[PDB]
């Protein structure tokens, strides 16, 4: 079957410059990559977790990427900085929702 997301990336806010993290979890998944602003995020920036599901023999994959205050202020696009999670299965692909990341001042 196609991958179903257990956890999709949530809309995040950067307050007091601390870099945020975007979470993604899909099953069945052999490979998971993040795409930010229509461009693929480098493999080295991904922190992956591959675990065998206690329920079925299907492989569960969890991936995290960090987004800094610098990355958001350096990006000059018509819309807010966004990241999408793409999961890979033995037979196909599945794309998660577009998660927005905006800077917020107190």
């Amino acid at each position: 079957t196609l991958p179903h997301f257990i956890e999709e990336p949530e809309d995040a806010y950067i307050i007091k410059s601390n870099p945020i993290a975007l979470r993604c979890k899909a099953r069945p998944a052999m490979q998971i990559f993040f795409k930010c602003n229509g461009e693929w995020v480098h493999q080295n920036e991904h922190v992956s977790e591959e675990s065998l599901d206690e329920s079925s023999g299907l492989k569960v994959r969890e991936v995290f990427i960090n987004v800094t205050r610098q990355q958001v202020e350096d990006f000059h696009g018509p819309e807010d900085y966004w990241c999408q999670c793409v999961a890979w299965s033995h037979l196909g692909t599945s794309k998660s929702r577009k998660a927005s990341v905006r800077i917020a001042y107190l």
């Binding site: 490979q31 461009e39 693929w40 793409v86 890979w88 196909g92």
Partner: protein, 323 residues
């Protein structure tokens, strides 16, 4: 002409009308068909649309399509299918468009499994194929012979087969940049048979060294930017005599082997910016090469990053510390 869709000067304007399907009332003698910025689904294409032979340019960008459209006009040359959600590429759909010359499948969810074995090969007239920003894991094997430009940039490609570029002798431009591609991932002698290739780009990838066995029969531009290139072999730049522009910037290069640009006689520009060049007796030849090189060659980015005694200075302006 349709009820909701307007037509002017033999051009059909169905764009920005929120159409669920492609309209039935398409005239026999129309030049360009506009169906972009709508909510057209994959099962919204009538068989009568394929019967129209006058149309050669069709715009279908920003739709709700999931597969490659069927029953498209028979003699269409240029086809735009960007900004939609295409995942599956069928062999039967590309067999219909026998006169297809230009194809744009940008900003889609196209994967390796989605592309049927030899689907693109069916489009016999295909000269330009733009597979930019897709979820493709590798370069498809079944490609057209008459292809001149293959732009498969910003994908999830890690492997390239030796049979992937079979019979493609007419290809001029190959852009495989912004991928998860490695030197072990690419097969031995995969690019060797690309005789008419003039440009090659592999920026933002994970290559430890430049691709081995590259043809220099017509190669002019070679882009090896933003890679993990640590070393460059002595035979890598050899047999590429017609090369004019070269870029080795933003890599993990410490030094260059003596006699690497020796075969590059028609060279015009070289860029090696953002590289950790260790300035010792290893770069002695680079200093001497830059001193005797003619003004025709535009060399930039040769600066010392180490040691602290030499740091900041340009390689060309140096003097040696050692014999």
């Amino acid at each position: 002409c349709p009820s909701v869709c307007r037509c002017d000067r033999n051009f059909v304007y169905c764009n920005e009308r929120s159409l669920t399907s492609v309209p039935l009332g398409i005239p026999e003698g129309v030049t360009v068909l506009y169906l972009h910025n709508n909510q057209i689904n994959n099962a919204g294409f009538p068989a009568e649309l394929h019967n129209v032979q006058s149309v050669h340019t069709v715009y279908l960008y920003g739709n709700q399509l999931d597969e490659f459209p069927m029953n498209l006009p028979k003699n269409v040359r240029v086809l735009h299918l960007q900004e939609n959600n295409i995942q599956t590429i069928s062999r039967a759909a590309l067999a219909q468009l026998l006169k297809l010359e230009e194809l744009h499948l940008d900003d889609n969810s196209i994967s390796t499994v989605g592309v049927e074995d030899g689907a693109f090969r069916e489009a016999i007239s295909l000269k330009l194929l733009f597979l930019s920003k897709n979820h493709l894991s590798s370069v498809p094997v079944g490609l057209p012979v008459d292809l001149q430009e293959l732009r498969v940039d910003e994908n999830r490609i890690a492997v390239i087969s030796d049979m992937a570029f079979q019979n493609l002798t007419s290809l001029e431009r190959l852009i495989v940049d912004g991928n998860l591609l490695t030197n072990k991932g690419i097969a031995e002698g995969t690019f060797s048979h690309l005789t008419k290739l003039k440009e090659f780009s592999i920026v933002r990838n994970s290559l430890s060294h430049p691709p081995p066995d590259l043809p220099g029969t017509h190669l002019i531009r070679l882009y090896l930017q933003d890679n993990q290139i640590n070393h460059i072999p002595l035979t890598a730049f050899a047999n590429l005599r017609k090369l004019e522009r070269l870029d080795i910037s933003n890599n993990q290069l410490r030094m260059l082997t003596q006699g690497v640009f020796d075969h590059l006689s028609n060279l015009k520009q070289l860029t090696a910016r953002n590289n950790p060049w260790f300035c010792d007796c290893s770069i002695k030849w680079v200093t001497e090469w830059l001193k005797y090189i003619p003004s025709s060659l535009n060399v930039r980015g040769f600066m010392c990053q180490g040691p602290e005694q030499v740091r900041g200075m340009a390689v060309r302006e140096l003097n040696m510390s050692c014999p």
